[PDB]
Amino acid sequence: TELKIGNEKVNSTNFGDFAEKAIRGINHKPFVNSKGGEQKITTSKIRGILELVNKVYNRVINTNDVELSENILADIAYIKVKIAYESGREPVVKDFIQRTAFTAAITDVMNQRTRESFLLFARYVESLIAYFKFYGGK
């Protein structure tokens, strides 16, 4: 629990509702590009976020330590670096990363340094992708 987001707090029970709220906020009022918008992020761009998170979820799902190891923490920091990098490449990705406060959750995971915190963060991201599905498509 205790996953800070920037304006609110998602505990272990409250990731799916926040994810659906963020997706609705994304689905409502789509992004504005140079040409007034308006296309939305692609399924194979939230893909990259999902496999990035899973590349540590697979390594943390099967363990019993309360606090994450230095190898897992390094990979979470690297996920943060990657999500910072790819946001600069495309603006339709950066609005997804901002409106859904990925960076605050990652930083809180890196501050808690606990297994349950990262499990909650991964659950939040997975619910986010799941809710992008069934609202959009393509």
């Binding site: 496999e51 590349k55 697979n58 990979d75 690297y78 990657k82 990098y85």
Partner: protein, 214 residues
Amino acid sequence: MKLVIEGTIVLKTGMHIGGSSDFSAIGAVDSPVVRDTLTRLPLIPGSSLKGKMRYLLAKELNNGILLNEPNNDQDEILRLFGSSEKDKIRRARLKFNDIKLSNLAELETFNVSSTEVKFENTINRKTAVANPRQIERVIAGSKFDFEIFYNLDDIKEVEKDFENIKQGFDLLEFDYLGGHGTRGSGRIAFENLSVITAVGNFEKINTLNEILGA
């Protein structure tokens, strides 16, 4: 009785089989090749080899056309690769294995590693701008020693099974294995195709070799 089909897979061009588990940097590789996790040695999954061989053989044996579902292939393909149909389950007479590359010492003699980096790009036909990628690829000249298990169930149709095995192997030789085959990659060759008895001895095992080597 059970038979072991040995042989070597030699790469003719670079061969890429996808699958990615960790740590794809932002300037180094965009599609790594599948590797043996312990020894880091690149491997040919038995799933991919079996699937490509089954596709080519099922397409060849049926009519040259193949649009059906795997559990509705021809009877040779069904009896040799298996079938999960409810009331008609064929137990597979082939057990493919994961295939690690064997001639790493030979490669190290030539002062090269087993994998290369291939630089590709796509050119948008509108603006003529290029989008580069970076495909890891197992270098040509790599050799993959394999072993396929054949469960000798019917003593009489083993010959037709092995003729179709050789036919599928030869179909692979004029095709690609894994990855971006139509764009240059994936070419392979087969050599030292020999079937041996897993335990005991088989009457037509000298016949099964000469229908594998020829």
